[model samples]
Target: AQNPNCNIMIFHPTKEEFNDFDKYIAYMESQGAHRAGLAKIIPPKEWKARETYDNISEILIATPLQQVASGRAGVFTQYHKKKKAMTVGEYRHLANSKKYQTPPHQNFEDLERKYWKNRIYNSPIYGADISGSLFDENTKQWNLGHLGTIQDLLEKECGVVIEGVNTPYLYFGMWKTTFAWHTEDMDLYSINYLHLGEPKTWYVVPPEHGQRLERLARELFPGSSRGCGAFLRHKVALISPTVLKENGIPFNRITQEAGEFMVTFPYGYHAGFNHGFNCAEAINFATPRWIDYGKMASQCSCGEARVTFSMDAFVRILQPERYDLWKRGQD
Candidate 1:
């Protein structure tokens, strides 16, 4: 009852038609990608993922050394193809100079133990946040998406500020940089756009089956799986797509390429790995339909420190807007 569908869908649209969310949503709802909980969009020529990274690299190179090393800028390490803790400084240098190469390391488990504290291929700061005109698209930035307009209306009407609700964050990834299994904070919608580089492979479990996987996790690591530390980050055995199918769990896979967008529906469990060097931008936002889920998301797997959205503000400002959209028959 918690989740309804579990499949992955791909859409290939011309670049000129890329920014239309109303049309996108209509197609998705009609064709059932919305129910599937995950969709990948491959756009036309004008939106090459590489150009976004080039712009970001220039901005990073121009930024002050203090900011780059402030620890606010994130870093990542890889375990599948190579292993190394790469800092923002190192990444920017490599990315700018085109000397990006995955280095070979033999001991995966030791590296996992040493650096993988609640951090498999994951980290509190796995990727850098490069955005705001640096990668901001005139039409396609997260804040301008269908859900973003709703969030913007809420902020405008209520005068309340929610930090990450409408902001875009950039991620730079190399081989094996992984994001573990979890839903978007508060079950909100999340969109990731790959600006350029090697592909990113995604594994998605439908919402209806998400909890089953969690229960399985509990069985596998009894007494030690609750907060993100133990369950979300601990290096578990690599559960490949084949294994998932063998277990009778329905899942979907996609190796997202340059100039493509991956959209994850509310409460969908997703995890993915970077093939090699790559840069991507992502952000989370919620539509009016997400109000109840937003309230429920207050209780998440991240434990007490879990981030919560402002439901009061959302309802106060967004109810009318939500009704207006419904009245207009535009999803």
Candidate 2:
């Protein structure tokens, strides 16, 4: 955690640079930000989103968040995870008090209920129409209605945010609410924006290490992944900095704050936890460059019966000119 050398590059793009999302992302790539698996972007200091809700009780809504207790902060096992329903109002109350909830905890069962705070994750913005969202309507870079986004390409009906991927998902996090290691759906690139909240610490591993990560896991966990091709998809494993270094895998730790964005490259592995109560919105997008990875993902699934959008349909619709290029090359 203390290694200054293992830093994920942070880019502060002006409102102008960030307005053209694709171009700025490519510029970050040229600047070698992508080499670290994920990079942070702080948008114009002038930017602060106004929540759609007039108050926390109404459209802010309530959702069940899975709560987990761990002996140590860094590694959280998939055991004893309890589902707790939390209203957005309750969460705000818990967050703003800055109680910190005190520490020195052990014995998951013995840990008092007061010791554990609910963190709502993977909870998409719920509404009859998310278009009314001030953030999405205002953040042109992340607008799903844009021509190149997955929602637009899939020609999903005017309403409904398909999965968190096609549209956006909201996350409410408290201290040590963990997101375990995994890649984005269909290996597409993902961008996450911290709308308003405290910092999130992200641990990232690069694209080239995709296979190496598996090999390390296969040996470390041994029988668990023996026949489990989808073992990593379980979202249970947490390889600490010591383990990452001992295994010779390069990693980066990124701290994402308010008004910031973190983009995880296709097939890159990333995991992190919240320092305190914060709200975030994230969505997956596939640029033309992501098509190759999408093609690769066509042959694989995330160890679940998921009917992801058709790659063929995507290519057919988006790359009609590809056949022309193929014919010209053959001629």
Candidate 3:
């Protein structure tokens, strides 16, 4: 498998700009990095990645600690007892508290489990106390501040908004450990910007490395069923390793402090690793789509949405004007 360890260090050489795409390609090759994969980079304008028709899984981003903590208090009033809004510490404690949920991955099994019964509105990332309480002033659907704020971040950084067909949240909360572990997947394609303070890890792997990852996951989370989470598309496999690297692998270093960067992995098994929880410095962005599975809706349902694991579509986004060339029945 192609090791991405070297690719992560390419930015160390600061060349104002590449003379051309070929030059960039050559640089990557020289550094032992493949073409850097279009799937991991932002898609050009005028083209959209294939729409996911699943039941709207979360496309989470790390948020300002204060905002997320306050949001947690508002959404899970019963579980949070501080009364006077919340401090970053207070929010972090509650967010990672045993009181919160982890859904299909953590609590249920094949729709027959207890957690599945409550699955309709339960969000492990965020409390489901506001479930069915549509008018309740605190629900994500109502407050929407959690997701709205993320979308706002995306627009500010990317200069493009998630279209009507896209949903910008998979779950809303501050950057936590477990949550960051599932940030990149086909079911949850997002435009993530590393904002706030301290850089979080961004891993990229080769397509041939997926099997090793699946094995690694089973080992890390043994007994705990990951179930049939989204299948890693070939492009996603290249990016999935990024999720792991940030979580624990230490494959590379990022010299660029926080600003704005775009990672558009339309299909990958990825997640983030937040070392700044109590410090409250981790934050990112995502735009979710409704790849809704009927029973659990959001747990990266398998059969409900049909996805192409090839990079053909992702490549099309880079050259949208020539998309028809990639379409079927074309020249």
Candidate 4:
């Protein structure tokens, strides 16, 4: 009952619809899908899944650095992060195992003693790149690779290769592991694909309300954002959707399942938690259409402690905007 009434737009796309990168986005914008900040697509049913993915033997594990429980609910509050390296085998029991269950505790007493005290744990594999033995090229969706907008334009026009912004990184998730709300690097567009596992729940605040969410962040995180405008980038600060709705900020939810793709629009503020264990791959993509938004974003975290990918570098690479046909997204 506390869930947001709004739902992110969902698409059942054929490969042809997926391939026309610019056309697909413009059509989605026209449909008012951009109002949701993100949208998801189910891959064509005919596309076969690779039988066995190479093993990822180990992953960096993350657990809460700090958390504040809402007094009344005693949940729906937050987690700041802390991390370490752990092998996949050791991490398995915290995930999809039938015995443990999410929240993974006998009661709030166990929650405090085990999770808060660090005797027990929860983990999420974040910003993981499979590296060398990793498929030489993007193996999941071809349209996201060479034929895509980022490769066709940014890399070609600028000759600059920004890894995660232009190349994919894998992510693994377990129950209660959350990704905090924030925009992409340089406020660029991002795409994520779940290879397999339980559905991940996502909440998004549209580009139009991006600052409304940011203002709320500023109010709640005054001690930090006052220090660094990039505080939210730290991937802390999880807020419930009902809180956002009460604040009158427009928002929506989506459940991204195995074999589906989710695209977060430019400047969209997104955050979500995993349902259980799942592995997903994601990368950022940008077209000339994103230039103005990127330019607008460069002013955000100025003089901050965190280092941001240089927009001037990419802008300098562009001779000038000339092309037509690509339509700006409408909120």
Tens-digit per-residue lDDT, 1-331, candidate 2: 2223434778877767757777887787776666677888877875555544446343343344444433333333433233445566766665555443323455322222222233222221211112123364554554523426764534443342333235566776665556767777557788887766666778898776677777777776666566466566656566655567888977777678877778998778887766666777777786656656654542223333233344334434445545353233323
- Each candidate's TM vs. the true structure? 0.64, 0.71, 0.34, 0.71
Task: Report residue 280 deviation for candidate 4 (angstroms).
Answer: 0.8
Which ranges in model 2 have alpha carbons more than 4 Å from their true place?
A: 1-7, 51-54, 57-63, 67-76, 79-84, 94-147, 151-165, 298-331
lDDT of 1 at 41: 78
Candidate structures ordered by TM-score, highest first = 4, 2, 1, 3
**Candidate achieving higher lDDT, 1 or 4:** 4
Ten-residue region with minimum lDDT total, candidate 3: 70-79
Assess each prediction's global lDDT (C-alpha) against the native.
Answer: 0.54, 0.58, 0.31, 0.60
Q: For residues 1-331, write the lDDT of model 1, one tens digit per residue.
A: 2124545777777755666665665566567676666888776656543233433443342221111111111222222322345555566455434333433445533333332232333322235444442344444522333244445644554565644345566777765556656677557788887777776778787765777667655654454454343343333224444445656767777678777788888767787666556777787765555555655442322332223244334433434434343233211
Measured by lDDT, the strongest candidate is: 4
Tens-digit lDDT string for candidate 3 (121-239): 33333221111111123322112223333334344544654432223322224322212223233233333433233333444433224345555554543433343443222111122
lDDT of 1 at 307: 33
Q: Residue 291 in candidate 4 has what lDDT?
A: 65
lDDT of 2: 0.58
Error of 3 at 10 (Å): 5.5
For candidate 3, give the lDDT: 0.31
